[PDB]
Design a protein around this ligand. Structure first.
Ligand code: MG
Ligand code: MG
Ligand code: MG
Ligand code: MG
Ligand code: MG
Ligand code: MG
Ligand code: MG
Ligand code: MG
Ligand code: MG
Ligand code: MG
Lengths: 41, 52, 95, 95, 137, 338
RNA sequence: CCGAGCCUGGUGAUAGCUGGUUGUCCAAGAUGAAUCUUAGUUCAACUUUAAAUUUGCCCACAGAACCCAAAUCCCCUU
RNA sequence: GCCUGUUUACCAAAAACAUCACCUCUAGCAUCACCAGUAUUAGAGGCACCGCCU
RNA sequence: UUAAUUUAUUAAUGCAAACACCUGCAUUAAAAAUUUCGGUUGGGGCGACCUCGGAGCAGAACCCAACCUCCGAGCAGUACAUGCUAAGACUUCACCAGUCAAAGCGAACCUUUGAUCCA
């Protein structure tokens, strides 16, 4: 039971993982874009 | 100074690894290789382990 | 150590040795490296790998440990699935 | 009552032999003092009418102080032994 | 018990004579209301840090005043250099101002004659000292 | 060795020793202002906030103004004739929130003694002027000089590798890669006394913040207190080192160039005798004339934010006050006429 | 024979300190680290004995750094 | 150093200790000391006969 | 004694326990009890030092002292394979500890301080 609970939780998190990775990278890039916009003023 | 913090896998695994981040800096989210999953995944800072 | 116990007259074992060292029957002593669990965050990966290893002892260190333990700890133990069963004996050793 | 416990475990003595105690076995820690336990009640069977408790032959839980200082010494109550319960049961059914 | 322990603090842990204790309880019974520990701190502040002796403490009713006011004025004087803790010999380079001049008087005369500073400076010092006490706790 | 002695000295802590030295000297120096200076020194210190020109300067200024701090620097250049340091009003004791990394990745502001910014504003950094910091490597004035323009070249020197590493830390924290990597920033760990020989008549604007008694920190911190009884010899030789460093700065500055001698001490010995002895030594041993430039206008301009001791003939002394616990800071502007 | 009596016992107290340690004869045998440690000890080096088998020392040529001397190390032969 | 006294039996007899006098502190009380007492009392400490000025 | 560790014992209180006396448990004192006095240097002082590292002494493999002559450090920046494994080696004259590393697997395409026990 514990093994399958771990397996299913891991499967769900892995299903979400690529989307979360893309979102985090996009947030970092947009923060950098905001920094450049601030530099432009 | 810097603080040692426990980055916990966001992949649901019990996997955690310790990194060093400045105290004044924001909480850390970092891509790291999860051995159990065998794939790079996000890790989020959970709690401060110590101050160094 | 106690060479002659007050109740049996026997030689005693230094249990601090038993808590730290593994004796391979052939006469070798295995140990962990000191600090292998200490402040790993500031140790390089190579240093951590060196510290995580099981290491043999000197001849004089082995002699000291042999003196500090009794013959019970120096016997053949046929444990079920001993990870050190293969290491308990030496092979192809010239002198 | 003060209840104590050895800090140091006493080695087993055997079957017919008596444990051999040493200086360290005279060191105790107080595990409990019974006098600080919450008060429990005494079961009594009344023999005479008494205010705010009962009349006669009814099992009553009274504070041990009252039961031992007023009821029992004066004969107003009797211990709730099986014999007393039986006797008062015959008394009740004979009415 | 409260009265007894207050008197016992005044006698044993503060070394006030019986007559001095009666004088204290007669001039300012608020000491009884004031909790232990705080009273001991006040007395030791007078004794060690301020260098006052029991006769002068009783004469000036130092125990009557509040600890916050006492600190606010004494620390101001000390940092200003107008007050110096008596040395081991009990002597000082300059005679210290009298406790009547320190605590009994109002803020105006206190800053005009003993400190010779400005009211605004005193307010700033009071706020700073309050912050210091908060941080110390 | 003789173990037993008839009498031993009281064994004062270094803080009390510094207090006794200050009481016996500054009392005479300042007369009736000494009690005020003393209480200010012993009380908390008023920290100014210097925004990082290499960050969201407008946003940080807005946040500080919301915190009710005002840029004393802004409304000073107008009368005196990029630097922006926000300080609370006279009497206010409000602290500044601890600095945090900014959106650009650099610390938004530096919490530093507002008094340790007047020498920078008095050196008169003109655009396209080569700048030297002979020994000033606590950060502070150095970072202030850095946050002045993107069209200027600056060198910072200090014998102490620890202080140089501290400068490097603050540089990585505040100065971006663009400026830090560029030649605009050149850091070194050499001896300033020989800087006259190392470079001569090279720099246009020099800042000589000689090692000083740092009176406030001396009273605050027991560790490495300059007034510890054993280190009396070093304390006594401090004037010689200060004179030598100022002479080296005056030698390195170009003819007609400008230097600012700076100190964090109230001592007239370290304040005016240093400059006069440096002038004498550098006009005799080297036959180079230096003129002390007046900063009375500067005093009036910054009177609102700082209290200045007027009796000092040469240089300007920001004395700490309870209303503005910003001092101490002695600074003298010297133009090399030859 | 009192800065804490005397006697007995624990007690053969403990002593990294001093002193002592008794037949004959032969042989081999001499100047670092840590340590509340430098009046001591443990490890090393040296030393002794016994055993295994196979190179050991000496050693020319070649070889061993830029910055800014005497020599040394290494080893074919012998 | 007030005094007569005491002291290191066995290297010190003293200016040291005590001492009347004085001061300070503590105590409102009985059946084994204090005491078969009770604030002009009792216990403790300091100081030094005494007397004159500040 | 404002050295460390205790409050067993008394005295106070407080809380329970028995309905003045007494038991248990706490706190604060008094009284005491037990125990310790690091090392190297410094005759006319009012301390300095103790670990690690760089340079000279010590010129050319290694190694070499000092109350010797000078200097520096108790980390930061970086990234988050800065992972895992593993031949063979070096080694601060012991040990402890400390270094380097092919091949291989896996991602990708880094430049100093401290043991054990105990938590
Ligand atoms: Mg006798
Ligand atoms: Mg013996
Ligand atoms: Mg021979
Ligand atoms: Mg030790
Ligand atoms: Mg010894
Ligand atoms: Mg006499
Ligand atoms: Mg005699
Ligand atoms: Mg006699
Ligand atoms: Mg005689
Ligand atoms: Mg080695």
């Amino acid at each position: 039971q514990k093994r399958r609970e771990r397996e299913q939780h891991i499967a769900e998190c892995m299903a979400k993982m690529p989307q979360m990775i893309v979102n985090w990278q996009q947030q970092q890039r947009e923060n950098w874009e905001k920094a450049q916009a601030d530099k432009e003023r | 100074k810097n603080i040692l913090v426990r980055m916990v896998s966001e992949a649901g695994t019990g996997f955690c690894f310790n990194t060093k981040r400045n105290r004044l800096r924001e909480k850390l989210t970092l891509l790291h290789y999860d051995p159990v999953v065998k794939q790079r995944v996000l890790f989020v800072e959970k709690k401060k382990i110590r101050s160094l | 150590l106690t060479y002659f116990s007050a109740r049996k007259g026997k030689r005693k074992t230094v249990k601090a040795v038993i808590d730290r060292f593994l004796r391979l029957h052939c006469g070798l002593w295995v140990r962990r490296k000191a600090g292998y669990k200490k402040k790993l965050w500031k140790k390089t990966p190579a240093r951590k790998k060196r510290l995580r290893e099981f290491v043999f002892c000197n001849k004089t260190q082995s002699k000291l440990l042999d003196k500090m333990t009794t013959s019970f700890w120096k016997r053949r133990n046929w444990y079920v699935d001993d990870p050190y069963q293969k290491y308990h004996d030496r092979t192809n050793l010239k002198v | 009552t003060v209840i104590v416990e050895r800090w140091w475990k006493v080695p087993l003595a055997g079957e017919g032999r008596k444990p051999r105690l040493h200086r360290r076995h005279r060191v105790y820690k107080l595990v409990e003092d019974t006098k600080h336990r919450p008060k429990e009640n005494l079961e009594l069977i009344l023999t005479q009418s008494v205010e705010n408790v009962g009349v006669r032959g009814d099992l009553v839980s009274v504070k041990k102080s009252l039961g031992r200082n007023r009821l029992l010494p004066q004969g107003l109550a009797v211990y709730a032994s099986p014999e007393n319960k039986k006797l008062f049961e015959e008394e009740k059914l004979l009415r | 018990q409260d009265i007894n322990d207050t008197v016992r603090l005044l006698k044993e842990k503060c070394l006030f004579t019986v007559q001095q204790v009666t004088k204290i309880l007669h001039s300012c019974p608020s000491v009884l209301r004031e909790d232990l520990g705080q009273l001991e701190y006040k007395f030791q502040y007078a004794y060690f840090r301020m260098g006052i002796k029991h006769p002068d403490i009783v004469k000036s009713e130092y125990l009557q005043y509040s600890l916050t006011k006492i600190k606010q004025r004494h620390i101001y004087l000390e940092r200003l250099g107008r007050y110096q803790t008596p040395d081991k010999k009990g002597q000082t380079q300059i005679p210290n101002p009298l406790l009547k001049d320190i605590l009994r008087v109002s803020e105006a005369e206190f800053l005009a004659r003993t400190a010779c500073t400005s009211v605004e400076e005193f307010q700033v010092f009071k706020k700073l000292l309050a912050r210091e006490e908060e941080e110390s706790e | 060795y003789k173990k037993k002695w008839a009498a031993t000295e009281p064994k004062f802590p270094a803080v009390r020793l510094a207090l006794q030295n200050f009481d016996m000297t500054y009392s005479v120096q300042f007369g009736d202002l000494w009690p005020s200076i003393r209480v200010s020194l012993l009380s908390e210190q008023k920290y100014g906030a210097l925004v990082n020109n290499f960050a969201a300067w407008d946003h940080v200024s807005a946040k500080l103004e919301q915190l009710s701090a005002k840029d004393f620097v802004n409304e000073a250049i107008s009368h005196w004739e990029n630097l922006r340091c926000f300080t609370f009003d006279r009497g206010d004791i409000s602290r500044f929130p601890p600095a945090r990394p900014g959106s650009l990745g650099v610390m938004e502001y530096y919490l530093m003694d507002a008094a340790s910014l007047l020498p920078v504003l008095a050196l008169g950094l003109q655009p396209g002027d080569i700048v030297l910091d002979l020994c000033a490597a606590p950060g502070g004035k150095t970072l202030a000089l850095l946050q002045t323009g993107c069209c200027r070249n600056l060198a910072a020197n200090d014998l102490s590798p620890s202080r140089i590493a501290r400068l490097q830390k603050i540089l990585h924290s505040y100065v971006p890669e663009e400026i830090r990597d560029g030649n605009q920033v050149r850091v070194t760990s050499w001896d300033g006394r020989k800087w006259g020989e190392l470079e001569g008549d090279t720099y246009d604007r020099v800042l000589v913040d000689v090692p000083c008694t740092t009176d406030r920190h001396s009273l605050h911190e027991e560790e490495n207190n300059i007034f510890k009884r054993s280190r009396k010899k070093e304390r006594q030789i401090l004037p010689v080192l200060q004179v030598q460093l100022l002479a080296a700065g005056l030698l390195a500055t170009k003819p007609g160039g400008h230097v600012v001698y700076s100190t964090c001490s109230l001592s007239h010995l370290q304040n005016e005798y240093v400059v006069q002895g440096a002038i004498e030594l550098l006009a005799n041993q080297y036959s180079i004339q230096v003129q002390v430039e007046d900063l009375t206008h500067f005093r009036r301009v910054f009177m609102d934010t700082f209290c200045f001791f007027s009796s000092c003939q040469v240089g300007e002394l920001v004395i700490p006050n309870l209303m503005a616990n910003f001092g101490p800071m002695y600074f003298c502007k010297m133009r090399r006429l030859t």
